[PDB]
């Protein structure tokens, strides 16, 4: 078993071929005394394995050490289904039959698939048979003129029925209502720095008499007013805090206001020490001056908005569906807002009412950034963002396929086969973990308004950048690149053209089977053990004033689960699956694998020191709609690996641009008019 793993293996493929083939002459054939660069062992995939393996076990056993200093599967053995319910929260029902629903859909799809799909991929001879390949379990072995695709499009097509039943069985278990009563204030924006509060409510008596309003909450430029009162209320704490030390000490103390100060332990320039309670007072002094000029310097300069506010729901809908384009008769037709002599110098055309949120927790210190200045932002943040996401992708791509540069020399003893497969699964999966740190920033600088919709816009927003940046990026790349060395490698202009009916992703498309199993063993063990929480509290523990402060770093060791950020990995994992489950069906069974392990590792991480969610259910219906939209993915992937292998005068391309049609077809009827 062991011998026969790389010892024989690697000398049987340089004694066959020789060429000489009658008729059939199928794409990467032979070479001179060698065989093609391309043909990798396996993908390297069992020493990886094994080394996975025993980095797991050693990372369990040091977690049982980090355990036993603050095995234990008895535990795991005994959790049921009820005590949750009893004695934790309730969100944590749902995400357990989310989380049962998603891993009996997979072990339903991997059970069905593994016995049918396995056989029809074998049944080829492209790959001259290779005992121990990888690649003919995969697409790449089957034939282009041959009927075997309408089963494969016929399964890939039952995904669809499949989980769109299970996505409305788990909506029936859910069984959460509609429960938004919040409609007595409508956001409006446009409005002109001139009018008053006076000149709107003469505008909507003269247009609307039915109504009657009291109060107009018309926003001032206080953005920088709660600036400054969060910056006071922290100075205030610290000067607090540092006279609380002073009481119980007796002692002066020194700080550095330079960043990263604390480390300037010599005399360097630029790391002077000041008295902590002075400085305090300064600047205490100067916010004091600022906030006091700033509140005489509010009226000078309006924002162009204001909030209005009712106490009936019927009226106010009405008023609220009239004069927009979303609520007013679909597709964007002839609205009539109520005329009057006040609308000429007040834009109700160009006017834009949407809902409002609960006026307690809207960021008033956020918006400053209205109007175009908006959209300047987030074309100067997010495309700097990808900028940096290309940057990010272009060299763990370029050393994963740093072996195939060159094209000659086909005796390919050069790759090592422990590196070019794990430092770059693992240095990509690390830029992966801290991207939602780098969005996270990038969020707060962006200083969205709305809380309600703040988990909603950072899963959304973190989504799409890990789709466009583990999913449809890399794989457009390494394909582009895999055409790059077939144009410089194989017949190019010695006697034919490009052949691009042998085209696939390099290393028998293997990368993303190495992610999976790193973000299953290795990567699980990492999420278990919390290598940055843990660097963190190191820090925080080390950083501090005397020897005997625990009492304040048990307060807020615990932390709140990441909805989004979890919500968002996890799907952008299963959608992944889902779009290389036609590709490649060996990443199945270790997709369910991976499963497995994260339901027993959320299961037991979910008792010991997670707190109980806060979060409402709308994050749950996005989950569902997100969920909902992973088979779309595949057939769009299924298409366009269908465009690419083969061209557009075969009536199954036609079909499958048919199918695609409705798919997309049948894609916003939920949108336009749906909620």
Same mark, same amino acid.
């Given at each position: 078993?062991?011998?026969?793993?790389?010892?024989?293996?690697?000398?049987?493929?340089?004694?066959?071929?020789?060429?000489?083939?009658?008729?059939?002459?199928?794409?990467?054939?032979?070479?001179?005394?060698?065989?093609?660069?391309?043909?990798?062992?396996?993908?390297?995939?069992?020493?990886?394995?094994?080394?996975?393996?025993?980095?797991?076990?050693?990372?369990?056993?040091?977690?049982?050490?980090?355990?036993?200093?603050?095995?234990?599967?008895?535990?795991?053995?005994?959790?049921?289904?009820?005590?949750?319910?009893?004695?934790?929260?309730?969100?944590?029902?749902?995400?357990?039959?989310?989380?049962?629903?998603?891993?009996?859909?997979?072990?339903?799809?991997?059970?069905?698939?593994?016995?049918?799909?396995?056989?029809?991929?074998?049944?080829?001879?492209?790959?001259?048979?290779?005992?121990?390949?990888?690649?003919?379990?995969?697409?790449?072995?089957?034939?282009?003129?041959?009927?075997?695709?309408?089963?494969?499009?016929?399964?890939?097509?039952?995904?669809?029925?499949?989980?769109?039943?299970?996505?409305?069985?788990?909506?029936?278990?859910?069984?959460?209502?509609?429960?938004?009563?919040?409609?007595?204030?409508?956001?409006?924006?446009?409005?002109?720095?001139?009018?008053?509060?006076?000149?709107?409510?003469?505008?909507?008596?003269?247009?609307?008499?039915?109504?009657?309003?009291?109060?107009?909450?018309?926003?001032?430029?206080?953005?920088?007013?709660?600036?400054?009162?969060?910056?006071?209320?922290?100075?205030?704490?610290?000067?607090?805090?540092?006279?609380?030390?002073?009481?119980?000490?007796?002692?002066?103390?020194?700080?550095?206001?330079?960043?990263?100060?604390?480390?300037?332990?010599?005399?360097?320039?630029?790391?002077?020490?000041?008295?902590?309670?002075?400085?305090?007072?300064?600047?205490?002094?100067?916010?004091?001056?600022?906030?006091?000029?700033?509140?005489?310097?509010?009226?000078?300069?309006?924002?162009?908005?204001?909030?209005?506010?009712?106490?009936?729901?019927?009226?106010?809908?009405?008023?609220?569906?009239?004069?927009?384009?979303?609520?007013?008769?679909?597709?964007?037709?002839?609205?009539?807002?109520?005329?009057?002599?006040?609308?000429?110098?007040?834009?109700?055309?160009?006017?834009?009412?949407?809902?409002?949120?609960?006026?307690?927790?809207?960021?008033?210190?956020?918006?400053?950034?209205?109007?175009?200045?908006?959209?300047?932002?987030?074309?100067?943040?997010?495309?700097?963002?990808?900028? &940096?996401?290309?940057? +990010?992708?272009? $060299?763990?791509? !370029? =050393?994963? *396929?740093?072996?195939?540069?060159?094209?000659?020399?086909?005796?390919?003893?050069?790759?090592?086969?422990?590196?070019?497969?794990?430092?770059?699964?693992?240095?990509?999966?690390?830029?992966?973990?801290?991207?939602?740190?780098?969005?996270?920033?990038?969020?707060?600088?962006?200083?969205?308004?709305?809380?309600?919709?703040?988990?909603?816009?950072?899963?959304?927003?973190?989504?799409?950048?890990?789709?466009?940046?583990?999913?449809?990026?890399?794989?457009?790349?390494?394909?582009?690149?895999?055409?790059?060395?077939?144009?410089?490698?194989?017949?190019?202009?010695?006697?034919?053209?490009?052949?691009?009916?042998?085209?696939?992703?390099?290393?028998?498309?293997?990368?993303?089977?190495?992610?999976?199993?790193?973000?299953?063993?290795?990567?699980? &063990?990492?999420?278990? +053990?919390?290598? $940055?929480?843990? !660097? =963190?509290? *190191?820090?925080?523990?080390?950083?501090?004033?005397?020897?005997?402060?625990?009492?304040?770093?048990?307060?807020?060791?615990?932390?709140?689960?990441?909805?989004?950020?979890?919500?968002?990995?996890?799907?952008?994992?299963?959608?992944?699956?889902?779009?290389?489950?036609?590709?490649?069906?060996?990443?199945?069974?270790?997709?369910?694998?991976?499963?497995?392990?994260?339901?027993?590792?959320?299961?037991?991480?979910?008792?010991?020191?997670?707190?109980?969610?806060?979060?409402?259910?709308?994050?749950?219906?996005?989950?569902?709609?997100?969920?909902?939209?992973?088979?779309?993915?595949?057939?769009?992937?299924?298409?366009?690996?269908?465009?690419?292998?083969?061209?557009?005068?075969?009536?199954?391309?036609?079909?499958?641009?048919?199918?695609?049609?409705?798919?997309?077809?049948?894609?916003?009827?939920?949108?336009?008019?749906?909620?």
């Amino acid at each position: 078993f062991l011998e026969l793993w790389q010892s024989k293996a690697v000398s049987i493929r340089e004694q066959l071929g020789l060429g000489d083939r009658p008729n059939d002459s199928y794409c990467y054939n032979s070479a001179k005394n060698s065989t093609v660069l391309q043909g990798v062992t396996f993908g390297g995939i069992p020493t990886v394995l094994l080394i996975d393996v025993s980095c797991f076990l050693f990372l369990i056993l040091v977690f049982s050490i980090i355990r036993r200093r603050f095995p234990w599967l008895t535990a795991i053995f005994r959790l049921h289904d009820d005590q949750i319910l009893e004695w934790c929260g309730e969100d944590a029902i749902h995400y357990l039959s989310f989380q049962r629903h998603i891993i009996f859909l997979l072990v339903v799809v991997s059970f069905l698939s593994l016995c049918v799909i396995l056989p029809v991929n074998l049944s080829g001879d492209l790959l001259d048979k290779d005992p121990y390949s990888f690649g003919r379990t995969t697409i790449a072995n089957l034939q282009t003129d041959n009927d075997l695709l309408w089963l494969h499009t016929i399964f890939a097509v039952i995904y669809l029925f499949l989980t769109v039943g299970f996505m409305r069985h788990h909506t029936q278990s859910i069984k959460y209502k509609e429960e938004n009563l919040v409609r007595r204030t409508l956001f409006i924006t446009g409005l002109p720095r001139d009018a008053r509060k006076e000149t709107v409510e003469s505008h909507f008596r003269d247009a609307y008499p039915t109504c009657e309003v009291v109060d107009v909450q018309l926003c001032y430029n206080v953005a920088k007013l709660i600036y400054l009162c969060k910056e006071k209320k922290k100075t205030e704490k610290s000067l607090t805090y540092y006279t609380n030390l002073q009481v119980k000490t007796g002692q002066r103390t020194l700080i550095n206001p330079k960043p990263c100060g604390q480390f300037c332990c010599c005399e360097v320039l630029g790391c002077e020490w000041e008295d902590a309670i002075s400085y305090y007072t300064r600047m205490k002094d100067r916010l004091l001056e600022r906030i006091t000029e700033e509140e005489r310097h509010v009226q000078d300069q309006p924002l162009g908005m204001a909030f209005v506010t009712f106490q009936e729901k019927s009226m106010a809908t009405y008023i609220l569906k009239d004069f927009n384009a979303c609520k007013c008769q679909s597709l964007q037709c002839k609205g009539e807002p109520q005329p009057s002599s006040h609308s000429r110098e007040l834009y109700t055309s160009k006017w834009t009412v949407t809902f409002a949120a609960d006026p307690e927790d809207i960021c008033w210190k956020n918006l400053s950034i209205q109007g175009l200045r908006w959209w300047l932002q987030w074309l100067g943040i997010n495309f700097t963002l990808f900028l &940096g996401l290309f940057f +990010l992708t272009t $060299p763990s791509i !370029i =050393l994963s *396929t740093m072996d195939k540069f060159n094209v000659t020399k086909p005796i390919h003893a050069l790759n090592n086969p422990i590196i070019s497969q794990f430092f770059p699964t693992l240095l990509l999966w690390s830029f992966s973990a801290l991207l939602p740190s780098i969005v996270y920033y990038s969020t707060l600088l962006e200083s969205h308004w709305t809380k309600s919709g703040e988990n909603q816009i950072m899963m959304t927003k973190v989504y799409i950048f890990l789709i466009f940046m583990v999913l449809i990026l890399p794989s457009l790349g390494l394909t582009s690149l895999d055409f790059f060395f077939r144009w410089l490698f194989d017949k190019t202009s010695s006697e034919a053209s490009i052949r691009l009916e042998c085209v696939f992703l390099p290393d028998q498309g293997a990368f993303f089977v190495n992610y999976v199993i790193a973000s299953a063993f290795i990567g699980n &063990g990492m999420e278990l +053990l919390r290598l $940055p929480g843990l !660097i =963190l509290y *190191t820090f925080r523990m080390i950083m501090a004033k005397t020897a005997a402060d625990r009492r304040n770093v048990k307060q807020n060791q615990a932390f709140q689960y990441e909805f989004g950020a979890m919500y968002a990995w996890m799907l952008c994992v299963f959608t992944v699956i889902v779009a290389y489950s036609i590709t490649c069906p060996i990443i199945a069974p270790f997709g369910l694998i991976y499963i497995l392990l994260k339901h027993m590792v959320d299961r037991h991480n979910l008792y010991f020191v997670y707190l109980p969610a806060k979060l409402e259910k709308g994050i749950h219906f996005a989950a569902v709609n997100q969920a909902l939209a992973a088979p779309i993915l595949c057939l769009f992937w299924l298409y366009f690996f269908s465009f690419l292998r083969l061209g557009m005068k075969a009536p199954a391309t036609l079909f499958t641009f048919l199918v695609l049609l409705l798919t997309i077809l049948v894609c916003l009827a939920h949108t336009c008019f749906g909620c």
